[PDB]
Every structure is written in structure tokens, then in C-alpha cells.
Ligand binder design. Structure first.
Ligand SMILES: [Mg+2]
Lengths: 57, 1150, 193, 62, 64
DNA sequence: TTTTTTTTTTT
DNA sequence: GGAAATGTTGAATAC
DNA sequence: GTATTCAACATTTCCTTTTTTTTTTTTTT
């Protein structure tokens, strides 16, 4: 699972954050997360290096 | 006071010895009368080089038209049918209008024939009175003296009114000391408003019975205050005004007069014709946005029962509005306009919703979702709710919000068009205001007054379809101001492009004489679409011929004989000079460390801009050094993109340092001129450079931009022979009116950068004219429909200005625009006949490849442009081919999306009569003309131009995405559209079909022509029509009678069939649960019936299949549908007589 | 446009000695003040609320003296009768003192003179065409209705008698047709009632 | 309205001017201008709305 | 409304006002009321009130 | 017949 | 919460 | 108005351009 979640500080409580919720809910499930700004270049094209990094992680 | 009797003994046959340009204009307008007739309009583009007599030629033509009117009025005064033929001189800038009027008056005063004056003093006074100038209202007021307007106020008794005299006193008091600028803007604003109010007052004073009789001094003062009155009186018929004023119109005492509504018989000289494209576009972009929800609700509410007088003056007007009332009632019922509208669910406050649509295809919505439209009767609201659709699947099911907005736009524009038609039926232009007011007041629609006034001057597959006649619409859906529970759909429209406006002027009857050196540049961003104008005007678009072009070329050579006199044009292409720039920078700051540091610190260049600045600065400095080291060139002009004003002072000091260094090294003093702006030339006149070259010794560098050096600015200077040396020579074979002047002799040309139109003004905040560019490119074929739709999407989503430029760069329209800039630059710098013995042209090397591809006809090029092109080429992909590919895709996707809408409307019961008629028209056109020899007018988008005559291969999913169609030999192996692939030859060999086809006029074979039907037409319409006609052809001769399937279930079955002696209703379908659903739908309305499914072509040996209502096989007596597999044998076209006999045997068992 | 107008006003203000200059400056300043308050009320209406504090807050309170009254920082106002009847702006909207007179203490100098001033203010309302007004009311109230949500409770009941009266009026007087005079020359002299 | 307190000061007056519409010679408008209350009605409305009014003038009760 | 005019006089004055009326004739209509005299005394009472604004007075003040 | 000069504010 | 690996600011220390 | 040590988040790269790089106008309201 890749969970495109918002920035961690902008969520005021742990249970509001999708991160730290499905992480404790699905205790036996591989997880990976990302922010949705972190897949654009400065011209807006998809950033392939990010998706290779996500896949290898 | 002078009268027309002064010309009684005037010799109208004596004319000055005409130039070849005058002869060319006269010959072209003679031929126009022969070909198109007397009352026809025309468009004559004249690619005349400015500086070789362009303005004199235009004004001499204008003067000849003035004398023709005098001769006609003297000769035909006894007829009484007076026609004061209007002549206009329009151009975009105020100063050019004023200058042209001044030059025409000067030409009247000083023209001579055979050494004798053309006109006497009284004749001169008569002609100069026929000419009028129409500025903006503020400047019109500030021209008039206090005596004139006091006379006007006294004569119209407005002097008694308190507010009128208060404002006039304030304006006068400002006018006494208006030297200050801020005083000037304030005075201009108040003068405009006061002129508006005052003219309103005389207009209401004049319309009624209290009409102040105007004569004598009051008439003169009024005509001075309102020059348009002289046109109404018939005392003047020549008007000098700008394009914006021409589009807006001018007042007289009676009303506002719009020249666009009265173009019949007018002659309209437009200077700088190709600049007027974007001027007209900016005038069209300024329309007031309007709310479609409010508009449709008001139209529906007021058209419900309000009606007109039923008097003789309202004949046939109610019938015009009758269809619109029915449509409004149906629309309000369907979309529940009793309720208001609101957004439900997804937050509209974080972002409103933007919808783009060209009214034909390429629809784009800013919402990622499928915004649908739901009527909640538990509440009383229409809710724009958001299904969670993703932005990527924009080709999904068509939502409801877009349909609602499109239909509302259609109804609104229909109302405006019906208003125009009703105004014409009510009535030639004083009736217009009264007609609009009476119609709007009878219907209680006075709130639409401004919309009708603003828009008045400005079944589709069967029509000539084009963007220029259609335009575009962008609608933003946002919360209403002050409320949080109601939504408005404010819409901004372009109903026509500037090319459409120009073609409308020509169709209305105007003879338009468009003069510009680049009048036929091959770009649609920076010029009118002449492909569209040639399609629409035909041969009313005049063109000077090859012999005429050769004569003009010879005349231009005789005035610019460089070669026989020894003038040489030297061209260099400069690239970056990094070492040269670095040495200069290290000389500028001797004790600094590195030249990169000098650039960063002392010049103030960020790390991002360093490479770009090093590129454009090195070329500029290399050109300047080569200019200074030259022995006798005296006048350089750099043309950059940026201005070198005080905002870039750190670079100006470095450039000044280098200039001083080279002036010392080569021992010639050079005076630079930084920041030659529009402002600089308004403040410090350009004659400062001229005076400097007239009095001082040495060289001169002038820094400017392409934008700064626009049309009408003359950079020539007065020659003082003591300073010039012997480097000036005269290149004209015959010289007259000596007045020694010369012009520029070195120039640097940077590559023009920001070429997409972008005004950045307030009115450009909606980005409408940024969609006009993508849609005009797609019209031309410069973009694939895929690229145009994607660019439209990114423009909706908010696009960087940089990225729009990159999208523009890959068209060949871009390169034609670049060459249009370069050709206009060197053209404006050549305005005299005294030249150096050498002229240097330094060019950015990024312009080399672009200029290498100039391949048009060089007969009318300027000498400098020829030199640039030849030098570019000497160091050495078709555009029409790429245009053919793109236009194949565009005509495909256009028909693909328009057939889908038409079928969806037919399946929406009831089927409207117009839709059925259009369906039949399309099928009849395709049956009669599968291919056409010339590009058709009325059905232009059923066809595509193929590279091979009569056939073409294509690849594309006919029910998938229309962006992914390819076409000619890009696809070697794929589907193929040809006469063979529809089996027309087998169909026409049959002895029953062929008489039917020859009787109906249908084509028995495909003509080998370039225009062939699009793949959507071939697969979805042509084959079905062929099958239906073949089946009807065979069965009608076996005693079947064929009549139309009615509107309740139209297009579900091709034809109702009636056999003689059988009374059970029969239905025909020609080529399971869906078919059973159709079965239930028909039998619900018409009871038990027989349905026939038959294929015209196939194997006749395969047996006939009998099915029930559920499409399950059964006995013939129990069957409800008969499935005839093959009516005509596919091998030899014999009739399947056994199958038809078995069918009629069943029909007897009914 | 804001910078252009403000700079023009400032340059006009730079000398402003001449009376007609003063008149022009007055009109321009009035219109520009109207536009500027319209805009800042827009940005304060939406979610993009500019937080006023310190120097900026004092600047707004100087430009909009009514903002001090809204903020609770000032509660004594000196203004003319005409301004009192018209109301004054704050950063949100226009505040009308007449709609919020509960608990107010109001000192009126030369009270009997204010009869004529109030009358002059009441005379200046805009006239309205009754035919157009009744036809618009009848046309729009025929089927248009409001949301039927808790924020619109008991409001449609307020309009129900008026809708019935509008339909009966339009039936009796035949408002499908427009109105015109017949016979005697209306243009010779209009009718006044 | 006879079952209510009747006074000019809170009924005011109406002046209607019937003329041809602007630009048309076949349609008439009814341009009405109203006074819905007198200044005394406005002053009494302020007092009824809860304002304490301190009217100072040497001729306050002329 | 005040009772200064009879309804007959008020309606005649309204009729003459509608048909155009000279200010001198409207003023003549007004002069017949006692409201006019109260207004006259109001004008006079303020004129001497606005001119009595200090406590230093002559031995003789002349009112003409 | 009676017999004038004053004013504010938004647009 | 792209990763690792490099790198700099601010803060506490603090001699 | 200190100097030195050090722990915490920024930044660039990545199966290698972010892309192109501006000034200019008329008219009514
Ligand atoms: Mg991790």
C-alpha cells in the first residue's frame, strides 16, 4: 500500500492522520507513504525518480 | 461658404501621372467590378513597402474617390437619388489618423498637374470641408473653444441647468492650466463624462417635437462639437478615425451612428491591416460577462405570457419569437428553473469551477470530477453535486452541468439573434433604437438593453462550420455575491473572431483596401486567417496578379536602385562570445576576482539568469564593436526585447564602459541613447537623435525594442553634408522635392521572444484571448486536436507564461511570426532614398535557421529582408503536409462528436423536426457526394482532404478516444476508406438497386477526388444509408410501401413498411436485451407488431431465422421478428428471391 | 487601476490651489474611496481575511473611521444629519445607524432645522416605473420559490398573500399586454396623478 | 385601515407621471415617486426604536 | 394634517400645484395660515438669539 | 399675486 | 511522511 | 559586545534542460 497522505504536522491529532492509523490498524501489512507535492518537477512533469524510490523502498 | 458649383468647369479627366501602385489599385478595382459586380464588397490586401510612397498612394486614391463623388453629384443631381458615398481611413493609433488627415489636407493644398495647381482656392476649401476627424469624446470636447460650446449651450437652453454649467465651469477652470499631467488625466475623465451627458441632452432635445432648428452659427458650432453631424447632414463624407472608434461608432445630434451597420457602398482604407486583427480581438474581449442562470430565468419568466401589440408595425415579429418561447418552456421544465442552483458537497470556496468549450468539441472542465445536476424536490434546489470522478478520464460519460450550461448559452444567443431579426423586421438605422426599445418594453425585458446594444454589431453539420463564425465560451460556476446558498454561471463569450468580423464587413458590401507590408503573413496569432477569408469571400478577396507584382517590383527597384549605385548590404550572424565578454568584464572591474563574480555582484545578475544574459549581452556588444570599428557608418539601432532603462542601470554602465573603450580605441566619438521607450519618445522627442546626427560629429547607438519601434514612427534625419563625408549616395533614378534626408545604416536584430499575444491588462484576467490562440491554431491545423485540447486544459488549470510559449514554439505559425517581426523591423528602417555605401545588419544566430526557411515569393520583399534571407540560406519538413494530418484528425473528431450529440438528441423523445431533417440531409449528402472535387462550403466537415485521391488508410478506435486517430501513410497497415470497402460495386450491380440509385441521383461509384468522407461518416452513416437504400430499392418493387417512422421512436427502426393486403403494423431495421427493450418500447405505443431485421449484403444460402419477442428461436407462426441474413448475394448481386418469398409467406400467415 | 487612480489623485492633490482643481479632486476622491472600500470589503468578506493589527490597523482606522466603532474602540460619533441618514462604512459593509438605534443616545443641535434636512433626504429617492415593477413581480413570483431549508423557515408564508394578490391583479388588469394612450395627444402634455 | 391609527406622517404621498417610454411612441410607463413617511414619522420611529434624542434649539417647540 | 387648512383649501392647493403654480401664488396660499405667523416669529426669535452671544452689552441696544 | 438664500452626500 | 548522504543553522555550552 | 562544540532539519540528486526569459495600446464608462 502507498498512502498519499498530507503533511504530518498539519494533522492536529494522531487519529486524524491516516498515517499512524492504518499503520496501527493493519499491523501485518507493508506500508509506504508520500506527500502529493513530491511527484512533480519544477515544471510540473511527473518525477520518475520518486516512483523508483517508492517502489524500491 | 463654398458650393459644389465650383467644380463646374473642373477637368475631371486630368489626373496626375499615376505611379505603378496607383495603376495596380485602379486595375484591381476595375477587374473587381467585372467579376463580382458593382454592388459587391471586396478585400484588397496591398503589400506596399512603407517609405516608397505608401501613404501618398492611399491618400491619392482617397482624393480620387472624393472627386468621383463630386462628378457624380454634378452629373446626376437631376436624378435626386443622392448617395453620399462614405470613405473611411482607419488605423489603430491616434497619431497616425491625425497625421494622415493632415497629409491629405496638405495634398489637396499642394498637388499640381503639368506644373499647374490641381485646385483653385474655392475648390480646395470645398474638398477640405468634406473631410472630418472623429476622436474620442474627451479629446473631442477639449478641442472645442468656450465660444463654440457656449453657443451650443445657449442654443439648446442647457445653460439654465445648474449641474451642466457647474461641470462646464469646473472643466473650463481646469482647462486654463492643464499643463500638469495629473490635471490632464482628471480633465480627460471629466471631459469625457461631460461630453456624454451633454450629447445625451441634445439627443433627447432633438428626438421630440421640440427640435431646435439648426442653422448658421449654431449649426457651425454643433458641427464643430459633433463632427458626426456633418456626415448625417451630407455635408461631409470622409472620416478619419481609429479602429476602436470605428467599432464603437460616433454620435450625431440624432443618435449614435455605427459604421458597421451601414457598410453598403462604403470604401474603407485600413492602414496596417494585419495589426487590426488583435485590435479587433481586444475590442471583442471587452464584452460584459453575464449570468446565464439569471438570464434564462428572466427570459423564461417574461416570455411566458407577455406579447406584442398585434398592429401593422409588429407584423411577423411574434412568429420570430414563437420557437424561442417553446424552447424556453421546455428548458425550464427539463431543468426545473422554478428552483435556484447551488453547489453540494465538494468545497467550491477553495476553488470555483471553470468550464471551457468551443461550442463544437474540445470541451475541458477545471473540475476533476463529473459535475452533475440534480433537482431535489424535498428541498427546492438544483444541486451541482460532485461524483468523485478523476480529471484523467475526461472522455467519460457527459455530465449534466455542461449540458445545462451549453443549452443555456444556446438559448441566450438565440434570444440575441432573434432580437436582431426582429429589429430588421420592424424596419435605416434611426429605427434601430426605437425597435429595440419597443420590443424590449413589450416583453418586459428592459434589463437586456445593454446586451442587445453591445452584441448587435457582432443544424450545424449541414452548415459551413468554422471557429471564426462560431467562437468560444468560458463559464465559471461560483457562489453568488453576498450569499452562500445560491450559485451563478457567469459566462464570457466570443461570438466571432476578427476574421469573421472582416469577412462580415466584406459581405455587407464594403470595399476594404488593406495596406501593410506584411498584409499576408502566414500566421493566425499575428494576422487574420486568410485561409478562412479565401474560403468565405471567394473571389471577393482580391489579389494583385503576377504581372502586377512584377510591375510593383520594378517600380520599387527604380526607387531603391542599390546595385547600380554601389550600395552594399553586409550581414553577420553572431553567437555567444564568452571569452570576449569575460575580457570586457575583467576590464570593467580590474581588481575583482572572476568575471562570473563581476556579473553577479556589479551587474546584478542572479545565478539563473547568468547564462541567458551572457548569451544576449555578448551578441549585442559584438555587434556594437563591429559598428564602432567601421569607418563611416553613423547610426546604429539595436532592437532587443527588453528595454535598457533605469531598471537595468547596472548593465547600461557596463555597456557604456565598453562603448567608451571602443570609441577611444577606434577614435570616433559615439553617443549612446539608452532606454528608447514608448514613454521616452513621448517625453523626449525622437528628433533629439535626429538633431544630434544633424549637428554633431561621430557615431550614435540607439537601444530600443521591437515593441517600441511600432508603425508610424519615422527614424530618418535631416542631412547636413558637412558631417556625412562622401558616404551618402542617391539610389532613386529620379529625385524630386530634394530636402536631403537619410536613415539608419546599422542594426542589431535579437530573436523576438514573447510572441503569444498577452496584454496583461485588467480585461485579460479571464484568459479568453489565450484560448482564442489555441483554438485558432487548431482551425489552421497548426496543432493536432489532441495538442490543442491538452493546451486548452492546461490553460484552464492555470498555466505558466513560459509553458504557453513552449507550446507555441513548435508550430510553424511561430516561425512565420518570427519572420514577420524581422521583416517588419528592417522594413521600417528604410524610409529614404539617400543611403550609405555600406549597410551592416547584425543578427542573432538564433534567427539563422528561422530565416533560412523563408520560401515565399520574393517579388515584394524589401532589399534588406532579401539580404537577410539569402545570407541565412547560403549556409544550408513541409507545413501543408502536417496541416493535412492535423485537419484530418480535426474533421474526424468534429464529426465524431457531433454525430454522437445528434443521435443522443434523436434518442431523446420526441425527436425534433430539425434534427430529423439534419440527419436526412447528412445521409443524402454522403449518398450523392461520397467525394467532392473542391472543398465543399455547406458540408465542409463531413469530408477530409486526402493525400491520395479517392481513398486513404486510417487507424483509430471508432468508439474510443478521438485524439488517437492517425491517418495517411503514418499508418501503412490499418483500416481503409475507399469505394471497395463499402461494397458499393456489388450493391450497384443488382438489377433492382441500380435503377433506384440512378433515379435518386446517388453515386454509383466514387469520383477520384481529394476530399473524401471522414472515417466516422464512412463507418457509421454511409454504410447504413447504403444498406437502407438497397433494402428499400429491392422491397419497393415487391409491392411493399414505405413511409416514415414517427417521432416517438424515430431512428430506432429505419422505416415502417406496409404490404398491400396485410393490416398488421410492420417495422424494418436494416444493417439481444437491448433489441427486446426496443421491442417493448414500440409495442407499448403501437400494440402487437412485426419487426424485421435484415442485412442487405451477405451469404444468401444461410437460412432465415425466426425469433420471438425475447429474441429466442421459435416457430414461424409464433415468431415476432424475422431475421433475413442476406437480401442481396454478395458474390453476384442477384436478389434473394427465396428469402423475400418466405417473408411474404410469413406475412400471409399473420 | 488602483495605482493609476491613486497616483493621479495624489498628483492632483500636490498643489490643489485652484477651486476647479478642488472640485475635480473632490469628485475623483469620492469615486476612488468608493472603489477602494468596495474592494477591501470584498477581501474581508471572503476567507482571505487580512488580519489587522498595529500600524496597519491604525491605518485602516484612519482611512475608515467607522471601523473603530465596529471594533469597539470608539463609541462617540460626530457626523451630519445627512451622513447619519446615509450611514458610514467599516471594513465589512455599510453600517446604518437607523437600523441599530436601541440604547443609543443622540444629541441633535438645531433640532427643528433637521425637519427640512430629513425631508430633503427623503425627496431624493429614485422614481420607479410601476408597470415594469408589477410586471416583473408578477412574472417572477409565478413559480420561483426558495430553498425550503431551516434558514428559510416561515419566509414563504410571508410571501404567499402577495403572490395571490399579484396573480389576481395581473388577471384583472391583463398584465400580459403593455400599456399605451389613445386619442388625446399624450406628447402634448403628460398625465400627472 | 380605519381600524388603525391614520395619519399623513406615516402614510406619506405618491406622485405618478404617465408618459411615453423613452424611444418608443407606442408604450407608456408609470413613473412614480413616493414619500413613505414625513420627517416627523422618521423621528418618532427613532424614538420607538429605543433612541434617546436630546433635541437642542432655541425654537425647538415652534 | 395639522388642521391648518380645510380639506377644501388643501385639495384646491394640491390641484393648483399639480397644474403648475407660481411661487407667489403658493406663498399667498401659505400666508392665510397661522402656521405662517408661527414661522415668522420663529425666524425673528432666532435672529435676535444668534446676535446675543456675549455678556458685554452697551448701555443701549437698538432694535429696529 | 409676492417679491431668496442656503446646504449634504453618494453617484 | 522518497531515500541516503552531505551540510549548515541555531542553540546550548562554556571555558 | 564572546569562542567553541554540536545536534536537527535542509538540499541535491536521482536511467543526466523546469522552460523561456516583454513592451505596448483606444474608447466608453
Ligand atoms: Mg521510510
Amino acid at each position: 500500500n502507498i498512502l498519499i497522505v498530507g503533511n504530518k504536522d498539519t494533522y492536529k491529532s494522531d487519529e486524524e492522520d491516516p498515517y499512524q492509523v492504518y499503520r496501527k490498524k493493519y499491523q501485518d501489512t507493508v506500508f509506504q507513504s508520500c506527500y502529493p507535492e513530491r511527484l512533480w518537477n519544477r515544471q510540473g512533469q511527473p518525477n520518475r525518480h520518486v516512483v523508483e524510490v517508492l517502489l524500491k523502498e | 461658404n463654398v458650393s459644389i458649383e465650383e467644380f463646374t468647369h473642373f477637368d475631371f479627366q486630368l489626373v496626375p501621372e499615376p505611379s505603378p501602385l496607383d495603376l495596380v489599385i485602379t486595375e484591381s478595382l476595375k477587374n473587381h467590378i467585372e467579376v463580382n459586380g458593382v454592388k459587391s464588397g471586396a478585400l484588397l490586401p496591398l503589400p506596399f513597402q512603407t517609405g516608397i510612397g505608401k501613404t501618398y498612394t492611399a491618400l491619392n486614391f482617397l482624393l480620387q474617390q472624393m472627386l468621383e463623388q463630386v462628378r457624380s453629384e454634378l452629373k446626376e443631381e437631376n436624378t435626386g437619388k443622392k448617395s453620399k458615398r462614405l470613405l473611411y481611413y482607419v488605423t489603430d493609433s491616434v497619431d497616425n489618423v491625425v497625421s494622415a488627415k493632415a497629409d491629405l489636407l496638405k495634398l489637396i493644398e499642394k498637388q499640381t498637374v503639368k506644373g499647374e495647381p490641381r485646385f483653385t482656392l474655392e475648390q480646395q476649401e470645398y474638398l477640405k470641408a468634406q473631410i472630418v476627424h472623429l476622436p474620442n469624446q474627451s479629446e473631442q470636447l477639449l478641442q472645442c473653444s468656450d465660444a463654440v460650446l457656449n453657443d451650443v449651450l445657449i442654443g439648446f437652453n442647457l445653460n439654465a441647468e445648474r449641474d451642466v454649467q457647474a461641470e462646464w465651469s469646473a472643466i473650463s477652470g481646469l482647462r486654463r492650466h492643464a499643463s500638469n499631467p495629473e490635471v490632464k488625466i482628471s480633465l480627460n475623465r471629466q471631459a469625457g463624462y461631460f461630453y456624454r451627458n451633454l450629447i445625451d441632452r441634445l439627443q433627447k432635445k432633438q428626438k421630440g417635437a421640440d427640435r431646435v432648428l439648426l442653422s448658421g452659427s449654431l449649426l457651425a458650432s454643433v458641427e464643430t462639437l459633433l463632427p458626426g453631424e456633418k456626415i448625417r447632414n451630407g455635408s461631409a463624407h470622409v472620416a478619419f478615425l481609429t479602429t476602436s472608434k470605428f467599432l464603437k461608432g460616433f454620435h450625431n445630434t440624432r443618435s449614435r451612428y455605427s459604421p458597421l451597420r451601414d457598410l453598403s457602398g462604403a470604401v474603407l482604407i485600413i492602414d496596417e491591416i494585419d495589426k487590426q486583427n488583435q485590435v479587433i480581438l481586444s475590442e471583442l474581449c471587452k464584452q460584459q460577462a453575464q449570468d446565464l442562470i439569471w438570464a434564462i430565468r428572466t427570459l423564461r419568466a417574461n416570455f411566458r405570457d407577455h406579447q406584442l401589440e398585434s398592429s401593422p408595425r409588429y407584423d411577423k415579429i411574434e412568429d420570430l419569437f414563437e420557437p424561442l418561447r417553446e424552447r424556453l418552456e421546455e428548458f425550464g421544465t427539463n431543468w426545473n428553473l422554478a428552483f435556484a442552483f447551488n453547489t453540494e458537497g465538494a468545497n467550491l470556496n477553495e476553488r470555483p469551477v471553470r468550464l471551457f468549450s468551443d461550442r463544437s468539441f474540445t470541451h475541458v472542465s477545471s473540475a476533476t470530477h463529473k459535475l452533475s445536476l440534480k433537482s431535489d424536490f424535498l428541498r427546492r434546489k438544483n444541486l451541482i453535486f460532485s461524483d468523485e470522478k478523476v480529471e484523467g478520464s475526461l472522455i467519460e460519460k457527459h455530465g449534466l452541468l455542461t449540458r445545462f450550461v451549453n443549452e443555456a448559452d444556446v438559448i441566450y444567443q438565440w434570444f440575441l439573434g432573434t432580437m436582431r431579426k426582429a429589429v430588421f423586421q420592424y424596419w435605416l438605422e434611426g429605427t434601430f433604437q426605437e425597435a429595440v426599445q419597443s420590443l424590449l418594453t413589450h416583453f418586459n425585458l428592459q434589463e437586456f438593453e445593454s446586451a442587445v446594444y453591445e452584441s448587435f454589431d457582432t443544424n450545424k453539420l449541414s452548415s459551413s462550420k468554422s471557429y471564426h463564425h462560431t467562437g468560444l465560451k468560458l463559464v465559471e460556476v461560483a457562489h453568488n455575491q453576498g450569499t452562500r446558498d445560491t450559485v451563478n454561471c457567469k459566462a464570457s463569450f466570443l461570438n466571432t473572431s476578427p476574421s469573421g468580423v472582416l469577412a462580415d464587413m466584406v459581405d455587407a458590401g464594403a470595399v476594404i483596401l488593406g495596406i501593410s507590408a506584411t498584409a499576408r503573413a502566414d500566421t493566425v496569432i499575428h494576422n487574420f486567417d486568410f485561409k478562412y477569408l479565401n474560403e468565405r469571400l471567394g473571389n471577393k478577396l482580391l489579389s494583385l496578379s503576377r504581372e502586377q507584382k512584377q510591375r510593383v517590383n520594378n517600380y520599387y527597384h527604380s526607387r531603391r536602385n542599390y546595385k547600380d549605385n554601389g550600395v552594399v548590404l553586409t550581414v553577420k550572424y553572431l553567437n555567444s562570445r564568452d571569452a570576449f565578454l569575460d575580457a570586457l568584464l575583467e576590464e570593467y572591474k580590474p581588481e575583482a576576482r572572476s568575471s562570473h563574480f563581476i556579473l553577479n555582484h556589479y551587474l546584478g545578475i542572479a545565478e539563473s539568469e547568468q547564462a541567458f544574459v551572457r548569451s544576449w549581452l555578448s551578441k549585442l556588444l559584438a555587434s556594437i564593436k563591429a559598428f564602432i570599428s567601421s569607418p563611416d557608418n553613423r547610426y546604429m539601432l539595436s532592437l532587443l526585447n527588453r528595454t535598457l532603462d533605469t531598471t537595468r542601470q547596472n548593465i547600461n554602465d557596463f555597456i557604456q564602459f565598453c562603448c567608451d573603450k571602443w570609441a577611444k580605441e577606434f577614435n570616433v566619438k559615439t553617443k549612446t541613447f539608452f532606454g528608447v521607450n514608448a514613454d521616452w519618445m513621448r517625453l523626449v522627442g525622437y528628433d533629439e537623435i535626429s538633431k544630434h546626427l544633424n549637428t554633431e560629429l561621430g557615431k550614435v547607438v540607439v537601444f530600443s525594442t521591437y515593441a517600441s519601434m511600432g508603425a508610424g514612427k519615422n527614424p530618418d534625419y535631416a542631412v547636413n553634408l558637412a558631417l556625412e563625408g562622401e558616404s551618402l549616395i542617391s539610389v532613386a533614378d529620379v529625385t524630386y522635392s530634394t530636402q536631403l534626408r537619410s536613415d539608419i545604416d546599422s542594426i542589431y536584430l535579437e530573436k523576438p521572444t514573447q510572441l503569444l499575444l498577452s496584454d496583461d491588462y485588467s480585461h485579460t484576467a479571464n484568459q479568453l484571448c489565450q484560448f482564442h490562440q489555441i483554438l485558432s491554431l487548431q482551425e489552421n491545423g497548426e496543432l493536432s486536436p489532441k495538442s490543442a485540447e491538452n493546451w486548452c486544459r492546461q490553460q484552464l488549470m492555470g498555466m505558466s507564461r513560459e509553458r504557453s510559449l513552449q507550446q507555441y514554439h513548435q508550430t510553424s505559425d511561430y516561425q512565420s511570426a518570427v519572420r514577420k517581426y524581422i521583416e517588419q523591423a528592417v522594413g521600417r528602417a528604410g524610409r529614404t532614398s539617400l543611403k550609405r555605401k555600406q549597410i551592416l545588419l547584425f543578427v542573432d544566430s538564433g534567427l539563422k535557421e528561422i530565416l533560412a526557411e523563408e520560401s515565399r515569393d520574393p517579388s515584394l520583399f524589401s532589399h534588406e529582408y532579401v539580404a537577410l534571407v539569402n545570407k541565412a540560406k547560403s549556409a544550408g519538413e513541409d507545413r501543408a503536409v502536417r496541416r493535412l494530418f492535423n485537419l484530418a484528425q480535426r474533421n474526424n473528431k468534429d464529426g465524431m462528436l457531433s454525430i454522437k450529440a445528434l443521435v443522443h438528441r434523436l434518442h431523446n423523445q420526441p425527436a425534433s423536426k430539425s434534427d430529423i431533417q439534419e440527419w436526412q440531409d447528412i445521409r443524402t449528402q454522403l449518398l450523392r457526394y461520397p467525394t467532392v472535387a473542391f472543398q465543399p462550403e455547406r458540408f465542409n466537415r463531413l469530408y477530409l482532404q486526402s493525400m491520395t485521391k479517392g481513398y486513404y488508410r486510417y487507424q483509430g478506435n471508432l468508439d474510443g478516444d478521438p485524439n488517437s486517430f492517425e491517418f495517411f501513410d503514418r499508418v501503412p497497415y490499418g483500416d481503409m476508406v475507399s469505394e471497395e470497402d463499402c461494397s458499393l460495386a456489388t450493391l450497384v450491380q443488382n438489377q433492382y438497386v441500380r435503377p433506384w440509385f440512378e433515379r435518386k441521383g446517388f453515386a454509383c461509384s466514387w469520383q477520384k477526388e481529394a476530399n473524401v468522407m471522414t472515417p466516422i461518416m464512412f463507418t457509421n452513416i454511409y454504410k447504413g444509408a447504403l444498406g437502407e437504400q438497397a433494402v428499400e430499392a429491392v422491397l419497393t418493387a415487391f409491392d411493399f410501401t414505405f413511409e416514415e417512422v414517427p417521432n416517438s421512436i424515430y431512428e430506432r427502426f429505419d422505416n415502417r413498411v406496409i404490404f398491400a393486403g396485410i393490416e398488421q403494423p410492420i417495422w424494418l431495421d436494416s444493417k439481444s436485451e437491448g433489441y427486446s427493450s426496443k421491442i417493448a418500447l414500440v409495442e407499448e405505443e403501437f400494440g402487437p407488431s412485426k419487426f424485421i431485421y435484415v442485412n442487405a449484403l451477405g451469404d444468401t444460402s444461410k437460412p432465415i431465422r425466426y425469433l420471438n419477442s425475447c429474441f429466442v428461436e421459435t416457430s414461424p407462426q409464433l415468431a415476432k421478428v424475422i431475421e433475413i441474413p442476406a437480401l442481396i448475394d454478395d458474390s453476384n448481386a442477384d436478389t434473394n428471391r427465396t428469402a423475400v418469398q418466405e417473408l411474404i409467406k410469413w406475412l400471409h400467415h399473420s
